[PDB]
Design a protein around this ligand. Structure first.
Ligand SMILES: [Fe+3]
Ligand SMILES: [Fe+3]
Ligand SMILES: [Fe+3]
Ligand SMILES: [Fe+3]
Lengths: 212, 212, 212, 212
């Protein structure tokens, strides 16, 4: 009868704010996490608020298209930032090349880590506008696929399971790199928590085929 | 070393081609499934072909943005059509209102089946341009969420698990309804295989939280 | 003080409804012009209504993003359909290859009419999803440019002056060609009112450089 | 016979690089103009290069969709930045409220400068992702319309004549305002060269109705 939608919370950074120095600044982490990521969480919740109010009869009409777009963009922002932080680890700890199933999967689907790294780097550097590059697991095939995302919710589609994501909205790098997205993406390699990615990939491998 | 990407296949319709009459014509099913859906499968595979050729060194350069966009749009087309067919059942068998966990989940998150039906119908009817309305499971919250999708890969974002989808590209209805998307979406309710949706929702409920 | 925004009208078809047979059906013209084009006009006006009501204080708040998107999509729909109809002429009268400044301009910028026709046809056939191909005049350079448009208001940008446009939303062709957009675009060549295009191009040539 | 497409040039800033201090930094102007704007010019030209090479037979096949998208995004970037710079004037000289036909037009279509300023500010602040807010002249009606643009070439459509544009890609403000787009847009008001806008609006008023 009465709808109470579960709202979104800003997850804590998985490390302290200078953990990614000198590749990503504490300052970038503060803006990026506590302001931009927070904004997407809040934007997602604000859609949910409109929906709820409509469904519980406090709002008479709702612009379902606008609320959908709002929800989806901001939820995309939330989930992708959440992934993004998880995918990184202190400059010491993360980085280097993946081992385990993920490393093997990358070799299988891109030939080598270096060929993957190159194509993935280029996918990130060549997001037109702002967005993301994502290494995803395709449940249909079991193949890894590189995706781009523009904004948080254009170009990307469903069912693909993102394992690793790099944000190339300018705010991810502008404080530290200004316009030099390329030099950001290049260095971001050294922050990758490949265990995190591995663990996600293991989970992905064991998700039931939902559609096909 | 040598990449061999797993290509996509056009799944068989889950019923004969006049199974959805008089709501959706055999003719629509023939065009929609065997031509449009096929085209997305083929378009997805053609991206994979470019990627492979690039990665195995037959193509020197690849436009990673273009191949990404191509892959994602067409894969979206494939997966969403695949869902779409599965979500329907002969005019006899499917339709009516959901029971089981899904029916309860709809009541919980939209108040009633009728409030959901109204909002979902409006989400479909008010896709701007062409796209989809999707009833999805949000693994983060356990909430159902209504999404829109424009094309197969705009507005939508990742992580959300689509349970039920209605295509509102014009080709889904134009043969049978011409411009009257609304009358199509209204009738499409009578084709819903709610067991299919239930089964997907059960699977969704038991997918490990991938991100958050 | 009191805002009264000028609303949009559906312009009359520039020929009777069977004027484009057998390439485009009267039936297609009826749906396409009197329903789809009308819908964009109405959608554009409905945005204007929200804006006005907001600005004159009848609506307290407005979702400026949503109204902007609404206005722009539908205005795009209106203006592009308006162009589209004007660009065609009875199967007898229109068609063939352009002479005058436009024909020369096409030769200059694409090498030959056949090279232009091929690339323009391919641009139309390869709109991903629905949209338009447009032959535009670039005031900055004086060059013709081929554009795509997705929906009526994605991919395209401002300042470019559209001269000739072909709609490849499915509704432009589905009644007559079903999924065979290609065969539609191929035949649409025979409807082009090249004088209309010429006249527009003359006007374009004599528009003051607005920006650059 | 042989196509030689006219490429794009980066126009000079219409003032020295610290002319907009303290609202927009010299540093922002250097990155924004000499790197980001330059990048769009170059990206536009690189599309033109592919087109030319294809048309003159040096490239066998072209991905017309990809080149179209590339051209349109970057040309949008070029033309909109070009407008953006022109629309600003040293903190001394520009700013305040418009007089002349433009000031009257704003009063006519938004009620008052303050109502316009509020709605326009909100349109800029509420671009989802990155893009632009634009005050445009609608040749069809003679009405001013506020547009949003996402990236340089989404949401916007043709025929509308942009008079005034504010960039809300993060790079327009991030150096000076970090995430505080709102405080940027608010201050940007003080840089508006309203004479520039007036002059453009005069030109717009005297452009022949191209379509309708
Ligand atoms: Fe970000
Ligand atoms: Fe479809
Ligand atoms: Fe149309
Ligand atoms: Fe910019």
């Amino acid at each position: 009868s009465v709808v109470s939608l579960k709202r979104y919370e800003l997850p804590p950074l998985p490390y302290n704010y200078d953990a990614l120095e000198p590749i990503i600044s504490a300052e970038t982490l503060r803006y990026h996490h506590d302001k931009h990521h927070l904004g997407y969480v809040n934007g997602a919740n604000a859609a949910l608020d409109k929906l709820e109010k409509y469904l519980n009869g406090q709002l008479t009409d709702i612009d379902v298209r606008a609320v959908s777009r709002d929800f989806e963009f901001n939820y995309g922002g939330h989930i992708l930032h959440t992934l993004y932080w998880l995918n990184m680890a202190p400059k010491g700890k993360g980085g280097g090349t993946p081992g385990g199933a993920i490393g093997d999967a990358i070799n299988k689907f891109f030939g080598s880590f270096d060929k993957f790294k190159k194509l993935f780097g280029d996918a990130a550097k060549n997001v037109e506008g702002v967005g993301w590059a994502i290494l995803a697991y395709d449940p249909v095939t079991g193949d890894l696929r590189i995706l781009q995302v523009e904004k948080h919710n254009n170009v990307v589609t469903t069912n693909l399971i993102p394992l690793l994501a790099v944000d190339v909205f300018e705010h991810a790098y502008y404080i530290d790199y200004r316009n030099d997205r390329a030099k950001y993406v290049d260095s971001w390699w050294d922050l990758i928590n490949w265990d995190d990615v591995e663990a996600r990939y293991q989970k992905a491998l064991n998700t039931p085929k939902l559609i096909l």
